[PDB]
Point group: C2
Chain length 720, copies 2
């Protein structure tokens, strides 16, 4: 019963290290750190001995293992990283069984139409309160599991609710005027449609394209210009931008400028072709995969935890130090962090009921035909959860990460398993604290952070989201941006060319005939923080320079002007990093009679210029439709139905259905259930260093405990 | 033969025994060693080493040759360090040179008995001769020269010596300059307070039983134009006192409203300032864990089993496309010099010299024990001197290389700081990534080289990271930790009568203790030479402009670009939404764009940001330190202008730093410029920062902007 170890392990996804000197094999895979000596009747798993009936065999310089090796060793039980959940958590995402079950319920529905698509199949949230009672009192929820089924019947949106427990269809509801998000088959349609269009073919041949089979299209939302674009609000449309495939594995580097096709997805036809001046396609091969590069040798570097991880994953609940939280996946927004508690000397304190991406937008600034309408709502319009990019083990996440698989429903209602969907990893983050008192023994502690990382790629854009749990109570939310730049074909080769000036009015000349058009990356996070309870108040603390009225030589002082933010409209604001914004529990105080709070920091830095607001005049539509892009901070009363900053059905939206609507009522934020919305972004002005591929650029956000604790949270257990 | 564990742990080597594989894994800096008991060979950084004497196990205790460490760690297999046959001209003064410099000034007829040395540093050869050495290996063909600054009681004298020729080049007393605080100043203060009956009396009033338990702190007094009632003439220090309650944290027991002014020359207290009696906060607040038990953790290691990607030849560090010189200064700490980027076999100049410029920690309380607090920790206390030896694995990751550094003490005697600087490479997420749908992923990991330095002055612990990104970006982060300077107050809780007044200038972080609001302002002096000496400052302001091109759009995203022509205009506030470049108007990239470096003074922070000086413009602190209120500064290169706060900041009556350097408002058009980045925080306290402060960080960045012709990390073309 034997197999060549090296192949089997690689294929298994285990890292295999052979030590000639020590005559030892080191195998690493997620929480499992294994040591095995050829011929040995014992293997070490996370520092624990494991008897092998069939030893590893070295034959003719090749290692061989039993057909049972991987299972016996990896799934030995010595790897305690993953545990079995006894009592299922109320927020566990729909299982593949439940997905199939939900699809069969609506399919067996009277009104179900064949060819209906599933934009989203998600767990319908149990009552927030029953869920907290479950997490804190382990009180069973006791309301049937329900699933939300959102379908696209051609261009129409219907909303169904299925009672899974009972296998019952609870509601069927047509949603008038709403457009559905772009589904994967849309991509294939656009390309086919362009391929079959005779006129298109003609437009491309007059633009110097010899092989019209070499044209690569991209499916783009058209937005809404109040008909100004000349597009019927009624039609299910997509704009089409095309590139030429020159085989360098980078079509994005070969734009066919000033050629736009409008596709009626309902009609499966090209309803309009916008042609502008002819710009020769930049033809030079610009591979980013290294196919033309010399691969330099670097010395090995590995981060190891030879005895296993400090965290435990039981079902979807992650336990690490004083942190407890539930981790699930949504096809639209991706990762969802729930029932986040902080174990304070045996008392689990509520920090966040649920936290997740709210939505995002990538608006362009070029008014030309191939650009003016670009303002991507990649989660809303494209489904970021669905588009998750599997973690490239060790490059995308450090070598000591644990990679989780996540299951979602595809647009057809068939369960889909995303491999290495989320990376979980503990990391050294410098000294937690230090004090080297003169002529005294040093006092230093190392800082440890638990990172939850997720990557989603939409078109040319690659997004990385890190949910960072600081051992001291702080929570960081970082977002990195990489991928390939959306570029404009231009005549200028250099800034010395006559068209250079006009060519670069809207972006930098990053290569010969290539302009990296300016745009912004705007991210919004939806954080339902419950600071040591549900009832919270928004408080402002503005550090000010006030005149010295107390005497002495000082002409001024540093004081703070503190005040509550009473309702939603006042809560919706720009964030001055020089100021302090707390979410406090007016009902609970720390040892000093100070209200337990969390400090909200929407702007904690970045590596690209900061997006001060949306870089759109206020008379602009995009600007209108989407208010979330302009304020950095928003606070709203908790509504189980208000989850998207851009609104639920942003495709060709005619008005603010997102944050503009949620606060529109200007309700009270006094001693009530608040939801924090943090907006952060970059203004991306290009440079040659970002072509052919872009270096990840990061933006940081932070949530810090503020009088939440009574002292340094990391000091340690008192022996007193 | 010796006990291996002892010998090794005594050597500073980490020892791991693997009972399963019967293997010893020994680590120290760049040395990654694997040895098996009884083996005739060992492994050093992946290379086999013949052993004279195999490791011997006795009583299940290992034994080694008294030659082992040498034989193995100094084998030559660990190539982390290399021999420097031609010393770099910026090499810092050696112990011998420190000793010889001291001899030379002591031999002058002018040397006064009891003279102290505030600073003894290299007077480097000329900037062009240094660049010629680094780039062309052209010898400076010069004699080492040293700058020797002495404190004759309270008098500053500046001398220059020629180390080869062993001669005094100059002797120059500095009129009106006060010298920085020397270590001995610390003990004279305590001593002087101890001997003061009056002082002892004041303490007595204040409820202090044993005056022997009183801990003083020697504080700079600044300059109030005489409103502090202090003579400008006198060498003074103010004294704040704490009571030692045996918790190892005197800082937690302030004696409020008792201030003593000491004349270090007269060696006596010249003034006692008494305010209202505030009982001393007595509750024991140890920060050293004497009272705690840490939660057990599973081991984590970062190993580089084949050694490091960098080489250290003398002080020359070579890593990937980066080449730079690291040296120590007693005032400012580390100096990063002759920084070049090896662009496909061609070294392009990035930075002639970069270091800490200076820094300030100014308080916002107008009260007697606070109003004067404006700590210039590097200029006034010597941060390089006060370097905190890295706590291996805690202060820096387990894969760091800890360097020892030598400077001169205040008596002119060489002083070697162990684990002065940490050098470490780290995984920084994906360098770049593109997961083209339905295609094989394209991902690369990002690697960063960090040069970390910690300095502790009084209650503050300062961490500085000089981060080399493989892609050409240079990051500069500053971490802040330690113990907070607190105020004793009568309120125990926010519900006390006095709670409101008590907290007027800071948060109530403990019973009877207020973390007094203050700022942390860092200034970095960066002599960037972007692909050359002659550069220009260019503003690129992203703007929304009305659309004139047609179609449905009302507006467009454009840039307002223009040159910043002189020092006054270059002296400004930084908008993180704008772009500031240092361009070489003499060189461009393949797209005809001038090679540049994007300057980012504010790249983020974990504490509220200091947008300016949290001071009224009529404030004396404000007047003296202009650097505090502008985030960006650019001045013409001048070897004598290195400090934001000026050379002699103690009791300065006016700005002799950046205020003076740009004063003349010279042109910055196609000339040798020096960038100064001011970054800060506004620290409003929390209970979570007491009794020890969780490290807070600030970030700054320098990114290549059209310096390259493409992604700098794709690699060489096949
Ligand atoms: Ca509302
Ligand atoms: Ca809430
Ligand atoms: Ca320069
Ligand atoms: Ca000048
Ligand atoms: Cu971008
Ligand atoms: Cu501080």
């Amino acid at each position: 019963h034997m197999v060549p170890m090296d192949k089997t392990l690689k294929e298994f996804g285990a890292d295999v290290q052979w030590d000639d000197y020590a005559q030892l094999f080191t195998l690493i895979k997620d929480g499992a750190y294994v040591k095995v000596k050829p011929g040995a009747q014992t293997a070490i798993v996370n520092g624990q001995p494991l008897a092998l009936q069939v030893p590893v065999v070295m034959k003719d310089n090749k290692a061989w293992v039993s057909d049972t090796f991987i299972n016996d060793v990896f799934q030995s039980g010595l790897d305690q990283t993953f545990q079995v959940e006894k009592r299922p958590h109320p927020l566990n995402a729909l299982t593949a069984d439940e997905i199939k079950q939900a699809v069969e319920i609506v399919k067996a529905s009277a009104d179900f139409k064949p060819n209906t698509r599933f934009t989203e199949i998600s767990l319908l949230p149990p009552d927030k309160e029953a869920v907290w009672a479950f997490a804190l009192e382990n009180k069973p929820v006791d309301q049937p599991r329900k699933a939300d089924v959102i379908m696209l019947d051609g261009k129409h949106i219907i909303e169904a609710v299925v009672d899974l427990q009972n296998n019952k269809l609870l509601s069927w509801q047509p949603i008038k005027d709403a457009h559905g998000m772009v589904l994967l088959d849309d991509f294939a349609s656009v390309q086919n449609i362009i391929n079959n269009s005779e006129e298109f073919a003609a437009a491309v041949k007059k633009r110097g394209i010899t092989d019209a089979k070499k044209v690569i299209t991209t499916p783009l939302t058209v937005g809404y210009f109040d008909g100004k674009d000349g597009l019927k609000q009624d039609a299910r449309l997509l704009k089409v931008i095309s590139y030429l495939d020159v085989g360098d594995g980078n079509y994005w580097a070969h734009p066919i400028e000033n050629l736009v096709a409008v596709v009626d997805l309902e009609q499966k036809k090209i309803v309009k072709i916008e042609e502008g001046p002819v710009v020769p396609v930049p033809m030079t091969a610009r591979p980013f995969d290294g196919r033309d590069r010399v691969a330099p040798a670097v010395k090995p570097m590995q981060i190891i935890e030879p005895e296993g991880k400090n965290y435990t994953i039981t079902g979807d609940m992650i336990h690490w130090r004083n942190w407890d939280f539930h981790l699930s996946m949504n096809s639209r927004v991706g990762p969802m962090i729930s029932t986040v508690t902080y174990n304070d000397n045996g008392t689990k304190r509520k920090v966040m009921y649920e936290g997740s991406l709210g939505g995002m937008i990538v608006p362009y600034g070029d008014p030309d035909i191939g650009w003016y309408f670009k303002a991507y709502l990649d989660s809303g319009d494209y489904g970021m959860g669905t588009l998750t990019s599997p973690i490239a083990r060790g490059k995308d996440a450090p070598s000591n990460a644990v990679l989780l698989n996540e299951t979602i429903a595809d647009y057809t209602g068939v369960p889909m398993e995303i491999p290495r969907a989320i990376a979980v990893f503990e990391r050294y983050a410098g000294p937690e604290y230090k004090h080297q008192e003169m002529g005294q023994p040093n006092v230093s502690t190392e800082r440890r952070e638990l990172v939850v990382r997720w990557i989603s790629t939409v078109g040319n854009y690659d997004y990385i989201f890190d949910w960072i749990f600081h051992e001291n109570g702080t929570i960081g939310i970082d977002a990195g941006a990489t991928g390939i730049e959306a570029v404009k074909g231009v005549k200028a080769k250099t800034m010395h060319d006559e068209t250079a000036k006009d060519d670069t009015r809207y972006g930098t000349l990053i290569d010969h005939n290539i302009v990296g058009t300016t745009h912004q990356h705007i991210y919004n996070f939806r954080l339902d923080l419950d600071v040591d309870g549900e009832n919270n108040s928004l408080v402002a603390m503005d550090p000010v320079v006030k005149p010295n009225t107390a005497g002495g030589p000082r002409t001024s002082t540093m004081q703070v002007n503190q005040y509550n933010i009473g309702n939603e409209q006042d809560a919706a604001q720009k964030f001055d990093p020089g100021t302090i914004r707390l979410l406090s529990n007016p009902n609970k105080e720390n040892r000093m009679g100070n209200p337990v709070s969390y400090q909200i920091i929407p702007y904690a830095g970045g590596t690209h210029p900061v997006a001060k607001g949306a870089q759109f005049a206020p008379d602009e539509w995009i600007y209108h439709r989407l208010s979330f892009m302009d304020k950095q901070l928003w606070v709203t009363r908790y509504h189980p139905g208000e989850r998207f900053p851009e609104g639920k059905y942003p495709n060709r939206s005619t008005h603010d259905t997102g944050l503009g609507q949620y606060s529109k009522d200007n309700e009270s934020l006094d001693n009530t259930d608040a939801v924090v919305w943090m907006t952060t972004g970059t203004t991306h002005v290009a440079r040659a260093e970002e072509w052919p591929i872009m270096p990840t650029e990061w933006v940081h956000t932070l949530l810090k405990p503020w009088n939440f604790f009574d002292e340094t949270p990391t000091l340690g257990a008192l022996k007193k």
